[PDB]
Design a protein around this ligand. Structure first.
Ligand SMILES: CC(=O)O[C@H]1C(=O)[C@@]2(C)[C@H]([C@H](OC(=O)c3ccccc3)[C@]3(O)C[C@H](OC(=O)[C@H](O)[C@@H](NC(=O)c4ccccc4)c4ccccc4)C(C)=C1C3(C)C)[C@]1(OC(C)=O)CO[C@@H]1C[C@@H]2O
Ligand SMILES: Nc1nc2c(ncn2[C@@H]2O[C@H](COP(=O)(O)OP(=O)(O)OP(=O)(O)O)[C@@H](O)[C@H]2O)c(=O)[nH]1
Ligand SMILES: Nc1ncnc2c1ncn2[C@@H]1O[C@H](COP(=O)(O)OP(=O)(O)NP(=O)(O)O)[C@@H](O)[C@H]1O
Ligand SMILES: Nc1nc2c(ncn2[C@@H]2O[C@H](COP(=O)(O)OP(=O)(O)O)[C@@H](O)[C@H]2O)c(=O)[nH]1
Ligand SMILES: [Mg+2]
Ligand SMILES: [Mg+2]
Lengths: 441, 429, 356
């Protein structure tokens, strides 16, 4: 069947995985012990869906995941937690030392000692998977394991597997907020090594989500859990068309064929519009029109960029719940009438639509309400260039004086490796300008 | 298993460390005998950072104590928490240094560094993965400075890929306690700047001000100052020994806080301090800790950051808190006070958060700053140095123990060059 | 006194190697007579740079061919005359693994480089000018940097494998830095200088790697001391005043990307160190260039042994020259540009020289 191998690479990735796997368990019916009481009443069913879970004859449901951090402090929170009886004990820590915010440590000195083992467990999983569609990697530009290790792994999987989909979910750095004075470099270098291997790198940022959680849900002091639960929901929309039934389903091989015109402009942005609290859950109709318009409001994005400073090249709109399609067609037409949403001349279609009948699951203890219908929008736009440019500027201001470089050279990296990277990114920025120019006859 | 091997040399070093072990025993639930008498389980998950198991659920620390005279060693034993140290790790000889660097580096200390290195190799090969070392010593005397610097040299030769952090009481501007502070400090700088990876500079006037105008203590003994230094020592290495939302070991801190290899001298600080009566008048939240941590009155270095600019600042938080608060408030610091931050480093801030705070507080924070104002320290020493070296004030006690004026000139040159590095990032262009 | 003297910058384009012929990287670099320009293989932003001297040994037959003795008589011979006027001399190389720095400086048995030519020309030109008016005195020093440590190249070790005795550098207040313990041995003519070069280029650290099998894992510095009397006639004794020279010719190691010439352990440790060194040197060059144009800067001489002992050469008091090596293949593009760009910085640096 249609199956996916989620890989969580680092702290950000593991914590997002915890969110996601809590939610998937809630959706299907799996207790943290791995047991599904749903067959207590209904025999011969399939709700512990094989895309994300594997079944033993004993009635367990073990996930298809690989967790990797190069530090024990984060997987050990699983092993000694509430989900200790679910994950296979082979959750990979050779984390005697972390990467010290260093792509050089995550790609060469401690990039190795673990990766062969990683690939072994992946091979064991894929061999159990007949109809594998792709991978979904969760990482973070800003660290080592999330910058360099991810790159190395993607390199190796583009050899050992090849014609498979390898999509990413990344926390793109913010323009103002940040937790590290070495993020720009790691970002540029990871983008250099990944642009030739990845197929679609969905991007998020935490400043945007902070602001969402402030305006709409009325949380002025949010933590990280309260953020990743949103990210979790995003994947659950991407992944619903494999798990639940629907009218128009989108497999993983249908994004990258629509949201990616040229092989290097595969950096789309996510949004999830009805991030509404239970108080404000009432006083609202929550129709398709409202949500589709919200997913195009810049203030409801999860990557801090203004689409009004650029052009949309594509947009995939994934609907969940009680949705009639006529409402989608009307909504998209309304959007195409507006002049603030300026599409390219070479994509007169622009949109893709997918629909599923299973509505979203409210995580208990949570901050989002039960909605009858939800929507996730993945949009490839030209505005993100500005963001890229910002990083490049930061890079220059540092690399002009070679700050922090002796930590990288110290861990086997040549100075030139930086320059090459920057140049490549410049090209990409130039490529974005090439796709905004109106065509001529 | 990221493990630390802790050395401590001299009077200051041993007293601070003893007060440190009485502070990391209280956090980890160890008693003066070695036994666990705790509440939680997380106290024991990561105790291996500092301690080793022995037999009966007794925990013997990885302390290496060093003195050139046995007077300070007998006080740790004949004291609260001395019956937990391994007696074979009290390496001490006679023939004190005499508040002289030479007697600690060349004459008497060279007759004892081999012993210390043996104890190290024992307490470093019994470790699954070592993250580094940490020494508590004192620039101002002979034994601490001398023997410590020598050991640094020898470990950075034998263990080069590892951390060598340092907590050093630097001399103070107004009043001294030795008449040969300058020389010894200059030579110790010469031997640290080339070897260490983090040097946390402490100054006792800052701590007395803290004990006077913040804690409002009328009788500030040294046991109180060491209780402030221990607080920072613990804060720096929390995230290796308790979980958190966003972690930060030592090497990460160094990578973020050390742009060029020699400017690894840090002004530290700890928040929150409330004097015992201003407790009920103060709210415990991030804005307050930030207001205190970035104030010049909470820093231990005796150097006003307002006379310079912050190359790189680091904030290790402990408690349940929102990350938005941290990020927002840090950006606010950088924006409102842009004149005190470098322009060619866009974000000058590093953040870490741990979940398990200190025993009596809901929130705690440690601050490590790399600023240019550290020049004001070394500059002064150089002035002192040359005001003596021009007249051979006290050098015959040094030459008599196998030294040459060349080393003095060398050290002066190095320290002045360091001052110049920190100067070139002081003006705004 | 003073003399604003710039650092004379030469560049050379080495021919193909065997592996470069196997993978078949075709021509990317071009000499417009003396100007040098490079071409990304996808016709991308053609780059152009200009230097005081260039060399195109890409093939024996092309117009503008420029070989070992030409490099010699163009840069090193001037510096020999300056070493005779009363100054000290620094010509220093830059490049990557397999790029020809060793071939251009020292050379092979049959085709030797600037070092033996400088020495031979010195000896012949001295014996032509050696009379009872002015005498001549000579001794030789040759040292290497390896893993941040100093080692003497002209000191054979005793019977135990690791006897590679390290030395330390020290700062004299007037004379600047120096090395303690350097067996500067004495010479009279070309033969014993040649025996010393033999023992040195034999004792120098080499290793087999994925680019050249006789790779250089060490920086090497060549400094002869040559004293010639200044024949005064005064009220008292004569001929006491004297004019000295100390040579400097520097052959460095390569940047050593760890995936192509890949190895684990020692062969990777030393590599890191090499790169670290190179990085620091870059800063110096960059910084000095800004120093020539008014900017207020600090030269980090002290973050490495190499740039620390060459402190009075990169700036300071010496007649100065750089030589860069580049290869004609796409493989080297950014590295070449890095190489080339550093020279364009070294073009702009000026130091103050004085008669000894
Ligand atoms: C009623 C009450 O709130 O008591 C608090 C208290 O009010 C204050 C005064 C405590 C108090 O600290 C001092 O009085 C003090 C004296 C000399 C030098 C420095 C401090 C306190 O003594 C200190 C003690 O701190 C701790 O409990 C931490 O666990 C602390 N423990 C130790 O340092 C310690 C020392 C020796 C033996 C065992 C533990 C700690 C701090 C940092 C890192 C690890 C542990 C606490 C909460 C208090 C008192 C008791 C008043 C404060 O101490 C610290 C470092 O957190 C001072 O500001 C904090 C919080 C309060 O202001
Ligand atoms: N959204 C989100 N971001 C996180 C979370 N945890 C960390 N981050 C982000 O991760 C970035 C730093 O990356 P890390 O994950 O800490 O680095 P790493 O992958 O752990 O690699 P190391 O530094 O070697 O430990 C920061 O910019 C954070 O914003 C999280 O739980 N949720
Ligand atoms: N201009 C040249 N013409 C012909 N052959 C050359 C030239 N330059 C170098 N070679 C050959 O190239 C080979 C390797 O060059 P080599 O001199 O070892 O590079 P290198 O400077 O030593 N770099 P490294 O070893 O990393 O310091 C030598 O065996 C030379 O014979
Ligand atoms: N903070 C603190 N400083 C101390 C203590 N004892 C000594 N000092 C400082 O140490 C310096 C002298 O160093 P000292 O310990 O005598 O070195 P030693 O004599 O070689 O062992 C003085 O400047 C004191 O300020 C102490 O218990 N606490
Ligand atoms: Mg981590
Ligand atoms: Mg060579």
């Amino acid at each position: 069947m249609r199956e996916c191998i989620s890989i969580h690479v680092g702290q950000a990735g593991v914590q997002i995985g915890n969110a996601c796997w809590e939610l998937y368990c809630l959706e299907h019916g799996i207790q943290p012990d791995g047991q599904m009481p749903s067959d207590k009443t209904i025999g011969g069913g399939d709700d512990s869906f094989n895309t994300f879970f594997s079944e033993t004859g004993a009635g367990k449901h073990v996930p298809r995941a690989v967790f990797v951090d190069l530090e024990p402090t984060v997987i050990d929170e699983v092993r000694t937690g509430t989900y200790r009886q679910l994950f296979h004990p082979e959750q990979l820590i050779t984390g005697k030392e972390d990467a010290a915010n260093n792509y050089a440590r995550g790609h060469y000195t401690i990039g190795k000692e673990i990766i062969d083992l990683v690939l072994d467990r992946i091979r064991k999983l894929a061999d159990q998977c007949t109809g594998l569609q792709g991978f979904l990697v969760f990482h973070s530009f800003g660290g080592g394991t999330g910058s360099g290790f991810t790159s190395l792994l993607m390199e190796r999987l583009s050899v050992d597997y090849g014609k498979k989909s390898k999509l990413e979910f990344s926390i793109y750095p913010a323009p103002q907020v940040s937790t590290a004075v070495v993020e720009p470099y790691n970002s540029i270098l990871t983008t250099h090594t990944t642009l030739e291997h990845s197929d679609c790198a969905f991007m998020v940022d935490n400043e945007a989500i902070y602001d969402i959680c402030r305006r709409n849900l009325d949380i002025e002091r949010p933590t990280y859990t309260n953020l990743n639960r949103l990210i979790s929901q995003i994947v659950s929309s991407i992944t619903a068309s494999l798990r639940f039934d629907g009218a128009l389903n989108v497999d993983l091989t249908e994004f990258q064929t629509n949201l990616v015109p040229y092989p290097r402009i595969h950096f789309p942005l996510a949004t999830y519009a009805p991030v509404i609290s239970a108080e404000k859950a009432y006083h609202e109709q929550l129709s398709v029109a409202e949500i589709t318009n919200a997913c195009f409001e810049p203030a409801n994005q999860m990557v801090k960029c203004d689409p009004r400073h650029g052009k949309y090249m594509a947009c995939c709109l994934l609907y969940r719940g009680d949705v009639v399609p006529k409402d989608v067609n009307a909504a998209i037409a309304t959007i195409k009438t507006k002049r603030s949403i300026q599409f390219v001349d070479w994509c007169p279609t622009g949109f893709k639509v997918g629909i599923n009948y299973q509505p979203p699951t409210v995580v208990p203890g949570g901050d989002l309400a039960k909605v009858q219908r939800a929507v996730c929008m993945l949009s490839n736009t030209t505005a993100i260039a500005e963001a890229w440019a910002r990083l490049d500027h930061k890079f220059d201001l540092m690399y002009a004086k070679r700050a922090f470089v002796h930590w990288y050279v110290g861990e086997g990296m040549e100075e030139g490796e930086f320059s090459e990277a920057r140049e490549d990114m410049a090209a990409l920025e130039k490529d974005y300008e090439e796709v905004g120019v109106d065509s001529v006859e | 298993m990221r493990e630390i091997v802790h050395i401590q040399a001299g009077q200051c070093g041993n007293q601070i460390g003893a007060k440190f072990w009485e502070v990391i025993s209280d956090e980890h639930g160890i008693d003066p005998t070695g036994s666990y008498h705790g509440d939680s389980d997380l106290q024991l998950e990561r105790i291996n950072v500092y301690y080793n198991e022995a037999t009966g659920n007794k925990y013997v620390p990885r302390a290496i104590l060093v003195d050139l005279e046995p007077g300070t060693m007998d006080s740790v034993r004949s004291g609260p928490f001395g019956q937990i140290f391994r007696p074979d790790n009290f390496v001490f000889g006679q023939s004190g240094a005499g508040n002289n660097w030479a007697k600690g580096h060349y004459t008497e200390g060279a007759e004892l560094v081999d012993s210390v290195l043996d104890v190290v190799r024992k307490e470093s090969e019994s470790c699954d993965c070592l993250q580094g070392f940490q020494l508590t010593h004192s620039l101002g005397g002979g034994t601490g400075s001398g023997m410590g610097t020598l050991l640094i040299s020898k470990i950075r030769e034998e263990y080069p890929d590892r951390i060598m952090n340092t907590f050093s009481v630097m001399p103070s501007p107004k009043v001294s306690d030795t008449v040969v502070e300058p020389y010894n400090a200059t030579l110790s700088v010469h031997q640290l700047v080339e070897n260490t990876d983090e040097t946390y500079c402490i100054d006792n006037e800052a701590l007395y001000d803290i004990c006077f105008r913040t804690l409002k203590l009328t009788t500030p003994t040294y046991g109180d100052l060491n209780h402030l230094v221990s607080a920072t020592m613990s804060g720096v290495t929390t995230c290796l020994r308790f979980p958190g939302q966003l972690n930060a070991d030592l090497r990460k801190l160094a990578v973020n806080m050390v742009p060029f290899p020699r400017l690894h001298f840090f002004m530290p600080g700890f928040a929150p301090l409330t004097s015992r009566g201003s407790q009920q008048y103060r709210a415990l939240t991030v804005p307050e800790l930030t207001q205190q941590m970035f104030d010049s009155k909470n820093m231990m270095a005796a150097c006003d950051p307002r006379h310079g600019r912050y190359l790189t600042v680091a904030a290790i938080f402990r408690g349940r808190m929102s990350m938005k608060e941290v990020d927002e408030q840090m950006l606010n610091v950088q924006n409102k006070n842009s004149s005190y931050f470098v322009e060619w480093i866009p974000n000058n801030v590093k953040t870490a958060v741990c979940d398990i705070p200190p025993r009596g507080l809901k929130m705690s924070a440690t601050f490590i700053g790399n600023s240019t104002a550290i020049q004001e320290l070394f500059k002064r020493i150089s002035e002192q140095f040359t005001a003596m070296f021009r007249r051979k004030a006290f050098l015959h006690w040094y030459t008599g123990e196998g030294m040459d004026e060349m080393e003095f000139t060398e050290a002066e040159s190095n320290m002045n060059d360091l001052v110049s590095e920190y100067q070139q990032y002081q003006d705004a262009t | 006194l003073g003399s604003n003297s710039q650092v004379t910058v030469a560049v050379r384009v080495r021919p193909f190697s065997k592996r470069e012929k196997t993978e078949k990287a075709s021509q990317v670099v071009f000499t417009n007579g003396e100007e040098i320009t490079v071409e990304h293989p996808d016709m991308k932003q053609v780059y152009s740079f200009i230097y005081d001297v260039s060399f195109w040994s890409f093939d024996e037959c092309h117009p503008g061919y420029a070989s070992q003795t030409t490099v010699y008589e163009t840069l090193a011979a001037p510096l020999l005359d300056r070493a005779f006027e009363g100054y000290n001399t620094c010509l220093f190389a830059y490049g990557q693994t397999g790029s020809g720095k060793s071939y251009t400086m020292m050379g092979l048995n049959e085709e030797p480089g600037i070092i033996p030519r400088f020495c031979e020309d010195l000896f012949a030109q001295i014996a032509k000018k050696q009379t009872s008016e002015v005498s001549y005195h000579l001794e030789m020093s040759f040292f290497e940097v390896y893993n941040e440590k100093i080692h003497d190249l002209l000191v054979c070790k005793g019977e135990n494998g690791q006897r590679k005795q390290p030395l330390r550098a020290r700062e004299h207040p007037v004379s600047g830095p120096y090395v303690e313990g350097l067996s500067m041995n004495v010479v009279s003519s070309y033969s014993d200088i040649q025996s010393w070069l033999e023992l040195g280029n034999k004792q120098r650290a080499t290793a087999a790697t994925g680019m050249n099998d006789k790779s250089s894992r060490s920086h090497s510095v060549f400094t002869l001391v040559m004293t010639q009397t200044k024949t005064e006639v005064v009220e008292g004794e004569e001929h006491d005043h004297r004019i000295t020279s100390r040579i400097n010719l520097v052959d460095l190691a390569g940047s050593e990307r760890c995936s192509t010439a890949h190895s684990s352990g020692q062969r990777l440790k030393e590599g890191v160190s090499i790169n670290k060194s190179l990085l620091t040197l870059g800063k110096v060059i960059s910084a000095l260039s800004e120093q020539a144009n008014g900017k207020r800067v600090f030269i980090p001489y002290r973050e490495s042994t190499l740039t620390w002992l060459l402190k009075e050469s990169l700036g300071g008091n010496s007649k100065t020259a750089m030589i860069a090596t580049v290869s004609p293949a796409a493989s080297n593009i950014e590295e070449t540009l890095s190489t080339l760009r550093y020279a364009t910085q070294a073009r702009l640096i000026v130091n103050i020289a004085k008669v000894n």
